[PDB]
């Protein structure tokens, strides 16, 4: 099968900033 | 390959607003992201998802996107904002990411700063090995352009000179160095050698002599 | 504290192979895409590869078929296996978190060249203030580290960017400005580390 798009992981950035600072 | 197009250079007056554009065919459907990289540092994310600001990034920095153009806006520009700014996004397929070519931000109005020049003669250990290097170090000048001329006594030296291109220091001024290769006999048989550094019309000369 | 510790860079001949590693701590590593990017000397940032937590992989067209990205979630480690290396792969390589790099490693330098490593020769540059220094001469490849008095001397230190000689070797200089009264009372030692040649040398700089 085909992989999903790299862009389908974009929301991890928001998750990251939930738990960690810049 | 999908590419993002940025202007290579943007200049801004202190206190004014810099606008850095980034164009690409997939931007209407793909988020833009922006990175700041100061000289000699790793990049920092300054905008994500077109317009979101990570905590700690100044409110003066904002991002927007319209059609195929994303824009990073830096208002109230300060000299500390000088850096390379890169946009970043993904292609129409969503399976590759790419950086733009980067935009160097220049903040105008910075005063002339004359170079500090230090010249060193060859070391005894180098001379013992049948080599001789003179080292001319040029630091803390602005803007980032100098010319370097070497003299043997008072005569111009035409061979053996290697000079670096000016590089931006962390304090936004520039540094460069110039090396003169000589035989030990050339070093010994002249009364002195000089490194002459010209910047904004002003010439500074340092001189060393065998001893 | 989030940490990304990179390793594995170095000098490799064209057609050779290298395995970069990025050991992560401070976050739930298996929850995030990890990304490789690189920057050639004097050039722009380039996206290299990405791998999702569960192992989906993505590659720049410039490295597809030659590089393989992988990860070990149990050891919180990211890898980039590089093969069929070309001169244009020379760069500092960074790992970073998520598909839009948010926290970057400090980098590891990869140099692809047929030239052998050459360790530097270090020469003292003898001295209200006075300048003394060290000439780090004839080495390959970049970079080299210079410290003074084991890192205890930082004020007045300026280490200059290297010159690329017509020979293809590099040279650089580090200079320290000191109070002139200290020239008879203080010892000044420059500490040079050129990692590709495993060169670690100290050179005392005394008044002439």
Coordinates of N, CA, C and O in Angstrom, one line a residue, chain B residues 1 33 35 37 41-45 86 88 90 94-101 118 120-121 123 125-126 131-133 135 137-140 162-164 167 169 175-177 179, chain C residues 35 37 39 43-47 58-61 94 99-102 104-106 122-126 131-133 135 137 158 160-166 171-173 175 203:
Chain B
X1 N 11.9 19.1 -9.1 CA 11.7 19.2 -7.6 C 10.9 20.5 -7.3 O 11.2 21.5 -7.8
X33 N 6.2 27.6 7.0 CA 7.0 27.7 8.3 C 8.2 28.5 8.0 O 8.7 28.6 6.9
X35 N 12.1 30.0 9.5 CA 13.2 29.8 10.3 C 14.2 31.0 10.3 O 14.3 31.6 9.2
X37 N 18.2 32.0 11.1 CA 19.5 31.5 11.3 C 20.5 32.6 11.4 O 20.7 33.3 10.4
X41 N 25.1 29.9 13.9 CA 24.1 29.2 14.8 C 23.3 28.3 14.0 O 23.2 28.4 12.8
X42 N 22.7 27.3 14.7 CA 21.6 26.5 14.2 C 20.3 27.3 14.0 O 20.1 28.2 14.7
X43 N 19.5 26.8 13.1 CA 18.2 27.6 12.8 C 17.3 27.5 14.0 O 17.3 26.5 14.7
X44 N 16.4 28.5 14.1 CA 15.3 28.5 15.1 C 14.0 28.7 14.3 O 13.9 29.5 13.4
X45 N 13.0 27.9 14.7 CA 11.7 28.1 14.2 C 11.0 29.4 14.7 O 11.0 29.6 16.0
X86 N 14.6 31.6 6.3 CA 14.2 30.5 5.4 C 12.7 30.2 5.6 O 12.3 29.9 6.7
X88 N 9.8 27.3 4.6 CA 9.8 25.9 4.6 C 8.4 25.4 4.4 O 7.4 25.9 5.0
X90 N 5.8 22.0 2.2 CA 5.7 20.7 1.5 C 5.1 20.8 0.1 O 4.4 21.8 -0.2
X94 N 2.5 16.3 -0.9 CA 2.6 16.2 0.5 C 3.6 15.2 1.0 O 3.7 14.9 2.2
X95 N 4.5 14.7 0.1 CA 5.5 13.6 0.5 C 6.9 14.2 0.6 O 7.8 13.4 0.9
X96 N 7.1 15.4 0.2 CA 8.5 16.0 0.4 C 8.3 17.4 1.0 O 7.4 18.1 0.8
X97 N 9.3 17.7 1.8 CA 9.5 19.1 2.4 C 10.6 19.8 1.7 O 11.5 19.1 1.1
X98 N 10.6 21.1 1.7 CA 11.7 21.9 1.1 C 11.8 23.2 1.8 O 10.9 23.8 2.3
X99 N 13.1 23.7 1.8 CA 13.4 25.1 2.2 C 13.5 26.0 1.0 O 14.0 25.6 0.0
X100 N 13.0 27.2 1.2 CA 13.4 28.3 0.3 C 14.9 28.5 0.3 O 15.6 28.0 1.2
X101 N 15.3 29.4 -0.6 CA 16.8 29.7 -0.8 C 17.3 30.5 0.3 O 18.6 30.7 0.4
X118 N 46.0 43.4 13.8 CA 47.1 42.8 14.5 C 48.0 42.0 13.5 O 47.4 41.2 12.7
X120 N 51.4 39.5 13.1 CA 52.4 38.6 13.7 C 53.4 38.2 12.7 O 53.1 37.8 11.6
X121 N 54.7 38.2 13.2 CA 55.8 37.6 12.3 C 55.8 36.1 12.4 O 55.1 35.5 13.2
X123 N 57.0 32.4 13.5 CA 57.5 31.9 14.7 C 58.8 31.2 14.5 O 59.1 30.8 13.4
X125 N 59.8 28.3 15.5 CA 59.6 26.9 15.2 C 59.3 26.8 13.7 O 59.7 25.8 13.1
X126 N 58.5 27.7 13.1 CA 58.2 27.6 11.7 C 59.5 27.9 10.9 O 59.7 27.2 9.9
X131 N 60.0 27.4 6.7 CA 58.9 28.1 6.2 C 58.7 29.5 7.0 O 59.3 29.7 8.0
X132 N 57.9 30.4 6.4 CA 57.7 31.6 7.1 C 56.3 32.1 6.7 O 56.0 32.2 5.5
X133 N 55.4 32.4 7.7 CA 54.1 32.9 7.5 C 53.9 34.2 8.3 O 54.2 34.2 9.5
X135 N 51.0 36.8 9.7 CA 49.5 36.7 9.9 C 49.0 38.0 10.2 O 49.3 38.6 11.3
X137 N 45.5 39.9 11.1 CA 44.2 39.7 11.6 C 43.4 41.0 11.7 O 43.9 42.0 12.3
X138 N 42.2 41.0 11.2 CA 41.4 42.3 10.9 C 40.0 42.0 11.5 O 39.3 41.2 11.0
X139 N 39.7 42.8 12.5 CA 38.4 42.5 13.2 C 37.6 43.7 13.5 O 38.1 44.9 13.5
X140 N 36.3 43.5 13.6 CA 35.3 44.4 14.2 C 35.1 45.6 13.2 O 34.9 46.8 13.7
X162 N 47.3 35.2 0.8 CA 45.9 34.7 0.7 C 45.1 35.4 1.8 O 45.4 35.4 2.9
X163 N 44.0 36.0 1.3 CA 43.1 36.7 2.2 C 41.7 36.1 2.2 O 41.2 35.8 1.1
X164 N 41.1 36.0 3.4 CA 39.8 35.5 3.5 C 38.7 36.5 3.0 O 39.0 37.7 3.0
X167 N 33.7 37.9 7.0 CA 32.7 37.1 7.6 C 32.0 37.8 8.7 O 32.7 38.5 9.5
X169 N 30.6 38.6 12.1 CA 30.7 38.2 13.5 C 29.3 38.2 14.2 O 28.3 38.7 13.6
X175 N 35.0 40.2 10.2 CA 36.3 39.9 10.5 C 36.9 39.2 9.2 O 36.2 38.7 8.4
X176 N 38.2 39.4 9.0 CA 39.0 38.8 7.9 C 40.4 38.6 8.4 O 40.9 39.1 9.4
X177 N 41.1 37.8 7.6 CA 42.5 37.5 7.9 C 43.3 37.4 6.6 O 42.7 37.1 5.5
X179 N 47.2 36.2 5.0 CA 48.4 35.4 5.3 C 49.4 35.7 4.2 O 49.0 35.6 3.0
Chain C
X35 N 13.3 14.3 11.8 CA 13.7 14.9 10.5 C 15.2 15.1 10.4 O 15.8 15.5 11.4
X37 N 18.0 17.3 8.2 CA 18.3 18.4 7.3 C 19.8 18.6 7.2 O 20.5 18.0 8.0
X39 N 23.2 21.4 5.7 CA 23.6 22.7 5.3 C 25.0 22.6 4.8 O 25.9 22.3 5.6
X43 N 26.0 27.6 2.2 CA 24.8 27.5 1.4 C 23.6 27.4 2.3 O 23.7 27.6 3.5
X44 N 22.4 27.1 1.7 CA 21.2 27.2 2.4 C 20.8 25.9 3.1 O 21.5 24.8 2.9
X45 N 19.8 25.9 3.9 CA 19.2 24.7 4.5 C 18.6 23.8 3.5 O 17.9 24.3 2.5
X46 N 18.8 22.5 3.6 CA 18.2 21.5 2.7 C 17.5 20.4 3.5 O 18.1 19.8 4.4
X47 N 16.2 20.1 3.2 CA 15.6 19.0 3.8 C 16.1 17.7 3.2 O 16.2 17.5 2.0
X58 N 10.4 9.2 4.3 CA 10.3 10.2 3.3 C 11.7 10.7 3.0 O 12.5 10.8 3.9
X59 N 12.0 11.0 1.7 CA 13.3 11.4 1.3 C 13.3 12.5 0.2 O 12.5 12.5 -0.6
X60 N 14.3 13.4 0.4 CA 14.6 14.3 -0.7 C 15.0 13.6 -2.0 O 15.7 12.5 -1.9
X61 N 14.6 14.1 -3.1 CA 15.0 13.5 -4.4 C 16.5 13.4 -4.5 O 17.0 12.5 -5.2
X94 N 21.8 17.9 10.5 CA 21.1 18.2 11.7 C 19.9 17.2 11.8 O 19.2 16.9 10.8
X99 N 7.7 16.9 11.6 CA 7.9 17.1 10.2 C 8.3 18.5 9.8 O 8.7 18.8 8.7
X100 N 8.2 19.5 10.7 CA 8.7 20.9 10.6 C 9.6 21.1 11.7 O 9.2 21.4 12.9
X101 N 10.9 20.9 11.5 CA 11.9 20.9 12.6 C 11.8 21.9 13.6 O 11.8 23.1 13.3
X102 N 11.5 21.5 14.9 CA 11.2 22.5 15.9 C 12.4 22.7 16.9 O 12.6 23.8 17.4
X104 N 16.4 21.6 17.0 CA 17.5 21.1 16.2 C 18.7 20.6 17.0 O 19.0 21.2 18.0
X105 N 19.3 19.5 16.5 CA 20.6 19.1 17.1 C 21.6 20.1 16.8 O 21.4 21.1 16.0
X106 N 22.8 20.0 17.3 CA 23.8 21.0 17.1 C 24.6 20.6 15.8 O 25.5 21.5 15.4
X122 N 50.8 23.5 14.8 CA 50.4 24.7 15.6 C 51.6 25.5 16.0 O 52.5 24.9 16.6
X123 N 51.6 26.7 15.7 CA 52.7 27.6 15.9 C 52.3 28.7 16.9 O 51.2 29.3 16.7
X124 N 53.1 29.0 17.9 CA 52.8 30.2 18.8 C 53.1 31.5 18.0 O 54.0 31.6 17.2
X125 N 52.2 32.5 18.3 CA 52.3 33.8 17.8 C 52.6 34.7 19.1 O 51.7 35.0 19.8
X126 N 53.9 34.9 19.3 CA 54.3 35.5 20.6 C 53.9 37.0 20.6 O 53.8 37.6 19.6
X131 N 48.6 41.5 22.3 CA 48.0 40.4 21.6 C 49.0 39.2 21.4 O 50.1 39.4 21.1
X132 N 48.5 38.0 21.7 CA 49.2 36.8 21.4 C 48.3 35.8 20.7 O 47.1 36.0 20.8
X133 N 48.8 34.8 20.2 CA 47.9 33.9 19.4 C 48.5 32.6 19.1 O 49.6 32.2 19.5
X135 N 48.7 30.0 15.5 CA 48.5 29.7 14.1 C 48.3 28.2 13.9 O 49.2 27.4 14.3
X137 N 47.9 25.6 11.3 CA 48.4 25.7 9.9 C 48.2 24.3 9.2 O 48.5 23.3 9.8
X158 N 39.6 35.8 20.2 CA 38.9 35.8 18.8 C 39.6 34.8 18.0 O 40.8 34.9 17.6
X160 N 39.5 33.2 14.3 CA 39.1 33.7 13.0 C 38.7 32.5 12.1 O 39.2 31.4 12.2
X161 N 37.8 32.8 11.2 CA 37.5 31.8 10.1 C 38.7 31.4 9.3 O 39.7 32.2 9.1
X162 N 38.8 30.2 8.9 CA 39.9 29.7 8.2 C 40.1 30.2 6.8 O 39.1 30.6 6.1
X163 N 41.3 30.3 6.3 CA 41.6 30.5 4.9 C 41.7 29.2 4.2 O 42.3 28.2 4.8
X164 N 41.2 29.1 3.0 CA 41.4 27.9 2.2 C 42.5 28.2 1.3 O 42.4 29.0 0.4
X165 N 43.6 27.5 1.5 CA 44.8 27.7 0.7 C 44.7 27.1 -0.7 O 43.9 26.2 -0.9
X166 N 45.5 27.6 -1.6 CA 45.5 27.1 -2.9 C 45.9 25.6 -3.0 O 45.4 24.9 -3.9
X171 N 44.1 26.9 7.0 CA 44.8 27.5 8.1 C 43.9 28.5 8.8 O 43.1 29.2 8.2
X172 N 44.0 28.6 10.1 CA 43.3 29.6 10.8 C 44.2 30.1 12.0 O 45.2 29.5 12.3
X173 N 43.8 31.2 12.6 CA 44.5 31.8 13.7 C 43.5 32.1 14.8 O 42.4 32.5 14.5
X175 N 43.6 34.6 18.3 CA 44.3 35.6 19.0 C 43.6 36.0 20.3 O 42.4 36.0 20.4
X203 N 49.8 24.3 22.9 CA 51.0 25.0 22.5 C 51.1 26.2 23.4 O 50.2 27.1 23.5

